[model samples]
Target: ASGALVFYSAVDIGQDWKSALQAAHPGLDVRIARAGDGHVEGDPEEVRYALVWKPPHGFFARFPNLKLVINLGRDDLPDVPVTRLSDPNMSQMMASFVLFCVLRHARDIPTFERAQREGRWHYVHPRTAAEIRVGVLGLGDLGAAAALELARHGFDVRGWSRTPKALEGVSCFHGLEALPGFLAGSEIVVVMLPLTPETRGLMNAERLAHLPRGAKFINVARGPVVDEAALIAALRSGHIAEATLDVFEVEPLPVGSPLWAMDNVLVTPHLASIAIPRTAAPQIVENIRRIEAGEPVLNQV
Candidate 1:
């Protein structure tokens, strides 16, 4: 088992990924490391590949022979060649979730939820999809998929990225110069950028201020991409009308954070989209096969 693949995650996936991986690769060795008890089921020296999600600090250091890391999802990790999931299911799931959040704000669902709590009937005029302008940050696989889904629903969709990109029915913008213009026009902004030095705190006070007044916000990407303090201030001051946040600056979002008590803000536990072992196993196994054969792997970031 010198070249075994080890799976580790801070979050419980509640499925047998080991079985799935082994089934996909036939005789390939797969092992699971327990996050709760700080235990690895097999010899650390035997691990050559790592499939991980938010692994603890210094986790990779334990495997001196590790050659490649396959991330289950986005997380800060040690210096290594890392590949992320690009399964069709992942893109479709993200698109569905983004659409759900956009529709939630556009349709004024929060107001109706508040009325239901008070046992009172509430109604708001419905707006057509063409009236809501949605800006999608980061035109990567997941972001592009989500933007296209929005456009398919007839919503005015615009996409922004660090580089130029093109998609049917979607207005695409790129580079630093176009950011402000993109923000100014978007009535609803969805964050889907990767976490990086340049992107960390990218949505600062100045950038958030560029968003049109009373705009709704959604973050299905990493939390630190936006300044949490700046976001809270905008939410408190009514500059941002509503938010649907699946990720946060801190996991579990601290018990005392005001976001939990805010009626207009929807906080979900980072469950916007997830990797399914059964569907994702083939892709991962293929990467392992490619690595063994000295070929380029898919989705390496």
Candidate 2:
């Protein structure tokens, strides 16, 4: 019997994944490993498939017969054919979260929130969406969806990536050289980049300083993509006016961190978007079927 293993520590999908997958393919054996323990349920030799997220170091080395890995989120793994979810639902959720943050910054919601806390009546005119120039970093699937959503809302949108790309109503920039010019014009910047070698700390002090003064910042991507200290410094200096962050360099952001006390910052528990097992399981099971039949997989990365 072919076996599948689930090793996830992010969001809890409960029994949704196992139930959905097994219901469709009755003969398949599935085991879910405990979050902290390295113990593998059933036989490791029977585990030909693995669905994982942020697995511990040397986790893959235990599964000798593993054929393919289905990543629940962005984390590096050992030598194996890895695939991420290709469902549009995930991208749509990402776009919605980005749009919410952009609109909040454009409408000056933070100032109102601060005033409400201080028992002071604050009045500020709301800016039109067209007046805001938003730059989207890393135009991948999630980034492209967010850029398009912003453009649809009448914001002057710009996008940058490692390579060239084109999208309607959005000014697209590419490569390292074009980044500076893009940042200069963007009054609000959103980060949606994947965590990669070159992209780690991509938004350093220098890049953060490139944005027009008083520019707002939002990050829905991984935490390490931006230098937390540099970002804190900018926020303290008021060069970056406000920030809405969904991910941080450290989970449960340490109590000693300055971001918690800052009025201009909004911190979410990394819930910008998530994989829904009901919708995501079909793709995973299909890939499993493909692997068994010696067929090419989808969304291999």
Candidate 3:
């Protein structure tokens, strides 16, 4: 049997996914190891595949046999200072992922999903594509692509970045002070901005008040980017109509988080959009293949 390495996922994923891999590489034996106390002991050579869910400190050294690390996050697994987003290639990918999540949910996918989950009957008046103005922050890869995609679909797209980025047809905003004007005009605002030293808890009660009551808010960006308690309070008081969130300031949302039990806010398990494992798995496999063939990895950034 061909040997393989299977890294652990935080949540228990059942046996169904194994069927896909069995088909991809018949008789390929996989060893599953959950990192513990920062160590996963095993025969290093037998391991050939890795699916890393959480990034461990000094992770690359721990798994010496790893030819590839498939961090569930976008490939830039290393936490970067704010500057990395300005790179052209990284900018494109980030913009696309953020935009996709915002639009998919903004179209009321969450409303239908909620009904199905609860066996309730409800329908929202579908907003015309052009009528919804989506204000996105962070014109990096995730933000810019999302902005462009929305614009292509005939939605008014405005994006903000720390530095000026020219996304064709995307209304751009810059400077710390311009955020209020952006919020006021938005009926469906999507936060795709980064979480930086200054940006942490940037979306506060003060800024939120500038938005039109009942306007929708979607967060696909980092959690702590907005104040969680304030958001929940806003939703409760009807200062904001609704919020659809895929990312959170704190993950698993802590079981006791009031947001989970609330009906007004749509709380998800950070699954706004999934980075498909099937598509991603082979890219990791190809990296190992490239290493064996003595070639440079395609996406190093």
For all predicted structures, in order, the TM-scores are 0.84, 0.85, 0.70
TM-score of 2: 0.85
- lDDT tens string, model 3, 1-301? 2446565555424133355455555665555555443355667676655655554555545544555454455343333211101123444554565555556656777677779899988878867877778888677667777788778878788877778778898889887788788788887788877778888988899988988887788887778898888888888888887777877766656788887877667776755445444545455555555655667765553
Overall lDDT per candidate, in order of appearance: 0.87, 0.85, 0.66
lDDT for model 1: 0.87
lDDT string, candidate 2, 149-226, tens digits: 999999999999999898889999999999899899999999999899999999999999999889999999998999
Model 3, backbone clash pairs (residues 3+ apart or across chains), number: 12
lDDT, candidate 1, residue 237?
97
In model 2, the runs with Cα more than 4 Å from the true position are: 11-14, 26-28, 40-42, 74-79, 118-121, 252-257
Score candidate 2 by lDDT. 0.85
- lDDT score at residue 239, model 3, on the 0-100 scale: 84
Output the number of the TM-score-best candidate: 2
**lDDT for 56 (candidate 3):** 52
TM-score of 1: 0.84
Off by more than 4 A, model 1: 1-3, 12-15, 25-30, 74-81, 163-166, 286-300
Give the C-alpha lDDT of model 3. 0.66
